[PDB]
Design a protein around this ligand. Structure first.
Ligand SMILES: [Mg+2]
Ligand SMILES: [Mg+2]
Ligand SMILES: [Mg+2]
Ligand SMILES: [Mg+2]
Ligand SMILES: [Mg+2]
Ligand SMILES: [Mg+2]
Lengths: 163, 158
């Protein structure tokens, strides 16, 4: 009931609208989406995380191919793949809590990118589950003031290449 | 030039489609877009990076405040802020180029997350400029085969 689609799309104004518009017209759900330029045959690459019925989630890919700005579409889960997200989290802590936040940041291989006497801003990259586990490890020991999270970026492993 | 908006919105489309529609109907360049779930199962946070078009963006933003599915809107480029991105880059990595890719990954403090005897996939997080510099340093030396970049996310400084 969860699918991850990679899309290679021409950078033109309107292209992102047409893709999102296609989902808006079925209630194809968008759990997360990332899109940004590649090293640029003027193309961008999009990663879309969708959740719902396997039936409608399979109508998706055929319809994406109809869009003139869409160059390639690949369902990442049908082969070996990697998925990552980045998160920034501002955390207020004192005493033992500051200790725990620092320790957990080390454990999760994050880094602190801003520091005041009462606040840390932590940058963490990993799978969604890794980021969720970081939040869970500190939520009841320190105060989470704000979270900014990217949503999933994905690529196939090895010589499976969307070109 | 460069503007970054963060938007909190009720998560379905129509909602996402309505926000992005405000940009496309003006033919306004979107360079990157990220959208992810928040604490609240009903709310998403979107971050959009655009190159404009000065005051046209101002008209888009007041228009954003008028949208029923939008809860809050912020310009990141009003801090005093931190902005970061992540990229996955798959690179043809043979002979001299394999040495070079490994060395440059070390230099930029990335990490290799997939290996074959002729390919590396590098994970790199940093500012947008850091990622750009990594690609510039390698693109003429080893063949970049795939790039998946997140788009920027950000927070104010404390
Ligand atoms: Mg074209
Ligand atoms: Mg120590
Ligand atoms: Mg040597
Ligand atoms: Mg050597
Ligand atoms: Mg060495
Ligand atoms: Mg060249």
């Amino acid at each position: 009931a969860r699918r991850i689609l990679s899309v290679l799309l021409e950078n033109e104004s309107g292209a992102l609208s047409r893709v999102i518009g296609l989902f808006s017209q079925r209630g194809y759900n968008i759990e997360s989406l990332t899109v940004a330029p590649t090293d640029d045959p003027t193309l961008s690459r999009m990663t879309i995380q969708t959740v719902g019925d396997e039936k409608v989630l399979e109508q998706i890919e055929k319809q994406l191919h109809k869009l003139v700005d869409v160059l390639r579409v690949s369902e990442l889960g049908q082969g070996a793949h990697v998925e990552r997200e980045i998160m920034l989290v501002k955390i207020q802590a004192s005493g033992y809590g500051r200790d725990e936040v620092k320790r957990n940041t080390e454990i999760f291989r994050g880094q602190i990118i801003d520091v005041t006497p009462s606040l840390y801003t932590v940058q963490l990259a990993g799978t969604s589950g890794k980021l969720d586990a970081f939040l869970a490890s500190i939520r009841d020991v320190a105060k989470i003031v704000e979270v900014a999270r990217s949503g999933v970026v994905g690529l196939s492993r090895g010589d499976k290449i969307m070109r």
